[PDB]
């Protein structure tokens, strides 16, 4: 079966017939599909279907190594007949075959198809001398896709090989371009499409082909000449032919030059014609500045705008290269500069460019003033994403700032003297007021350069505050200069700017927010206020007068009046930023006001899809309220708990988008909850189950989730906590994967277990222990430390610390469950079978773990590795409380345990209650707070837990030792105890007890 097998098979015909998968993998299927495309006597649609499926099959099975492979015979035949259909003009076939060829070339080039680019070289030789410029066009399309794809190989030597070979192609391509260019320069024929594609391909080949392209002389030749073509195209765009496509080549050539200077300013500059390009674009910038300025995209098109942007961006790349220096590590960077410094970057060009920018490019364009008028809010909504790379005035602002920062060219008098001169004009009629606005714009931009030469503190009160309160100007003129003063304050507040000047500015912007209705001025103000608040040197004290009012105005005027999604987003995030910077001052009334906007906007965000981002912001906001509000944070519950309930609920759409921010909010809600100030709302426990779904999906945030769990361990009772089923299941999983956890979440798990042990006072005679056993915690702890492939003694002590905490509280049950653990172990034979690092050093078919010796003798050796005073004492208390069991093997090692006792007793100097400043080093809570995090309710909960129920700081080591011995004397018979005191080597004990019984004050 063959010919109609891939035709009839194309709901009824698409569904049923479809039994072609059986043929997809056949040795000949793909050459057949290719043949079908090649044979131009088949229906155009049959050919197209065949080439579609053929490219898809290249991707599916081209690789012979993978199953369902195709043989080398078929692959070679196919590879042979890939550029045969260059005689077919149809682009819908040509580009598909080109993608198939590009994929085959990516998979098979430096090996398996080394003749590429040499096959192409002869294709170009054979068709460059041919009427069929159609064949040339299709060859060029295939080269386009092939060069593209091969240039994207970051691995191996495929891309290098291409770079080496494609010089054999470059000159031929150039010839093609040149010929066709000339052809249609003056005639009315339209081979232009071929010249266009040839220039695109040349851009590729130059860029992803040649490192230091200035060294291949043919590339240098072509670039220069293309510059001449560019200049022609420019001057005759203004002359004869007035068509859209007359700009396409200008764009492509600009793109080439720009890609070259971006890829390497050094390689670009060292082009013979680099300065030709630079000066050409500089002349365009200087001479055509009025055309750019007066341009009105809507009526004409943004050609002049875009071309000016292009030239300025090239100049920016160059300026950056000069500002610093940077595969040369010296040679290439020691000459390149100098070429351009002397052949282009002369003083009287840099300053001239500055003048030009100041007059024509920093000026508010007429079109911008017209747009401002009709829809201001959208005029600045577009600028919330001010993409300087697509807008001439922003671009120019940026390039000017780069110029000012790259040189010490204090031409401040040009501003002093152009204030005296050309700003001293009109100021009633617009043009010399807009010029003045551009002058002030230059002052703004140069903030980072001339703060040492300028008394800004003076100027604010001297000049700008007058301007912005001046009552003798149109109203529009007022808006312009007011926006401009706001922007100036913005750039200068983060440099030379007294906090007093900043208070003045806070007042000024409050006045704007109160008075102005122009939304450009309002939003410019908002952004300047924000940036002064997010300033690293933001002295919040100076802003707390204006705080109340400004939050009110953002809440009551701005955020309501704005109706563009991301402007609302900006206002929400500003309010949040302000709250984070001003945690001292906040009123409950203000808090209520903020909470008032929250649910409205939440309704919006969760209903209307396109507003979902706001929800995230809202979460942020609420979160920053909670932690900012602190131990009054429960006031947000009315709103915050429901919000969490919806954002962390894995049944709503919006879980996918909000869950994480929600979980963070939930965390904070618990961390800033103060039982001293409120009853713990029951709902937080009803939410708990959501955690599980997070754990079983976003493991990327598992720490966060664990923190939440930690919070409950510090809030709830152990009765409560261990009753929770979700917490039990989570513990089950953590035990299943304890040693697999990432260190951060591993530590969190152990911390949680430690918090439960401590806070679970003691009354539990089996609650917590029955729960740890039930949920596999107990078993996992011992499984880890008895692994033959032992863990890092550091991590081993991390684990054992938990065991020591337990040992202190009911060591008998510990041992009991050790026994249980022993009974339920695998057989020693089964242990011998198991893999690399899950073999254990104990087994069921074994003694009673050499009477607990394995455990205790390993632990008293870990101890030698311990160094932290606090943790050292935790461990010794574990060991001693274990001694209290009087079990044979434990009791056996009394010699060593008493040696440890003597060691530490001679070391440490404890108080009455057994605390020591050396036990409070890693202590979390102290009087450094204010500069970092003023202490949260949870930090204090934890601190009081440790203070009150952590043996370390309450019990004396001395007392514990003596009372342990008393427990032995009572648990053992005094007969047995006195016997023991001499059964364990009585001479070494004579000695040891000589030192141990030394009990001073």
Swiss-Prot record:
It is found in: Cytoplasm; Nucleus. One of its GO terms (biological process) is protein import into nucleus. Gene3D superfamilies: Leucine-rich Repeat Variant. The keyword Transport applies. Residues 16-88 form the Importin N-terminal domain. One of its GO terms (cellular component) is nucleus. Keywords: Acetylation, Cytoplasm, Nucleus, Protein transport, Transport. Present with 6300 molecules/cell in log phase SD medium. Functions in nuclear protein import as nuclear transport receptor. Serves as receptor for nuclear localization signals (NLS) in cargo substrates. Thought to mediate docking of the importin/substrate complex to the nuclear pore complex (NPC) through binding to nucleoporin and the complex is subsequently translocated through the pore by an energy requiring, RAN-dependent mechanism. Required for nuclear import of Ho endonuclease and RFP1, and involved in rRNA-processing and assembly or export of 60S ribosomal subunits. Belongs to the importin beta family. Interacts with GTP-bound GSP1 and RFP1. Associates with the nuclear pore complex. This is Importin beta-like protein KAP120. The lineage of its organism: Eukaryota, Fungi, Dikarya, Ascomycota, Saccharomycotina.
